[PDB]
Design a protein around this ligand. Structure first.
Ligand SMILES: *NC(=O)[C@H](C)NC(=O)[C@H](C)NC(=O)OC(C)(C)C
Ligand SMILES: [Ca+2]
Length: 240
C-alpha cells in the first residue's frame, strides 16, 4: 500500500497473508480475505505459479511474533473457470482456497462480510485498502499491515479515456487514483473494505495497478467486484 498508515491490530480481522515456500522460509506474495473458517478468497493471478502456499490469519507484523497468528496449509485451489493469465483486463481475477484445517475465530480472526449480489457502490464511496504490499513503486513490502483511504471511482469515470479506458470492465471496482495513495505489488488478492449501512463489507479483491507505477494520478487501483461473483462463490463452497 502506497501512502498508507499502520492499521490497528484488530481493525481488519478477515485480512490474511498468502505465502509461498521459498527455500527454508515462507515469503508473503498476496493478501486474501477469510470468508469461511476453511475458505479464503484471493486473486486468481496470485496462484498462477505452482508453488506451495500457506495462509496466515491473525497476522499483523510479517517479521515478528504477534502472539495471534494461525498458520494453515492450502488444500485445494479453485480459480474462476474463465480466468486467463494472459488477459487480466478481461477480469475474472478471483480464486477460492480451501484450507487444510478450520481456523479459530477470535478478535483477530473473523470472517469478511460479503456484499449482496449485484451491489454497485456510488461514486466516491468510502473504502479502505489493506495489505503488506510495497509501500512505494519498486519499493519494498511493509512489515506491518497498512491501510489507505481509497474512495471509489465509478465505472463511467474509470472507463473514460483519461482514466483506464477499455481496460476496466463493469465486473471491476476502481478506487483511489489521487497520485498519493494506492494498492501496489503484494496487496493483490487482498480486500477493499467499504462502509455500507454502518458495516464494512469486502467489495473488491485487489487485482492490478498501472505498469507505470502504483500511485499514478487517474490510474486508480482496480479490484475484482466481489458482488459480481456471489453465485459462483456460493456454488464452489457448497460442493467442496
Ligand atoms: N500483487 C501481485 O501481483 C504479486 C503476486 N505480489 C508480488 O509481486 C510480491 C509480494 N512482491 C514481492 O515479493 O516483493 C519484493 C519486494 C520482491 C520482496
Ligand atoms: Ca507476525
Amino acid at each position: 500500500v502506497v501512502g498508507g498508515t499502520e492499521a490497528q491490530r484488530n481493525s481488519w480481522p478477515s485480512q490474511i497473508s498468502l505465502q509461498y515456500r521459498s527455500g527454508s522460509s515462507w515469503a508473503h506474495t498476496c493478501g486474501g480475505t477469510l470468508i469461511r473458517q476453511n475458505w479464503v478468497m484471493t486473486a486468481a493471478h496470485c496462484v498462477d505459479r505452482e508453488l506451495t502456499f500457506r495462509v496466515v490469519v491473525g497476522e499483523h507484523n510479517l517479521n515478528q511474533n504477534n502472539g495471534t497468528e494461525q498458520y494453515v496449509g492450502v488444500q485445494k485451489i479453485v480459480v474462476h473457470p474463465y480466468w486467463n493469465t494472459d488477459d487480466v483486463a478481461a477480469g475474472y481475477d478471483i480464486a477460492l482456497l480451501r484450507l487444510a484445517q478450520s481456523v479459530t475465530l477470535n478478535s483477530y480472526v473473523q470472517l469478511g462480510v460479503l456484499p449482496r449480489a449485484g451491489t454497485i457502490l456510488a461514486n466516491n464511496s468510502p473504502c479502505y485498502i489493506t495489505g503488506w504490499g510495497l509501500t512505494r513503486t519498486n519499493g519494498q513490502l511493509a512489515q506491518t499491515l497498512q491501510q489507505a483511504y481509497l474512495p471509489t471511482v465509478d465505472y463511467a469515470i474509470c472507463s473514460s479515456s483519461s482514466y483506464w479506458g477499455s481496460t476496466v470492465k463493469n465486473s471491476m471496482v476502481c478506487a483511489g487514483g489521487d497520485g498519493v495513495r494506492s494498492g501496489c505489488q503484494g496487496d493483490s488478492g487482498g480486500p477493499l473494505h467499504c462502509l455500507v449501512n454502518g458495516q464494512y463489507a469486502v467489495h473488491g479483491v485487489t487485482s492490478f495497478v498501472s505498469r507505470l507505477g502504483c500511485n499514478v494520478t487517474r490510474k486508480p487501483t482496480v479490484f475484482t467486484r466481489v458482488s459480481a461473483y456471489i453465485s459462483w462463490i456460493n456454488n464452489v463452497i457448497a460442493s467442496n
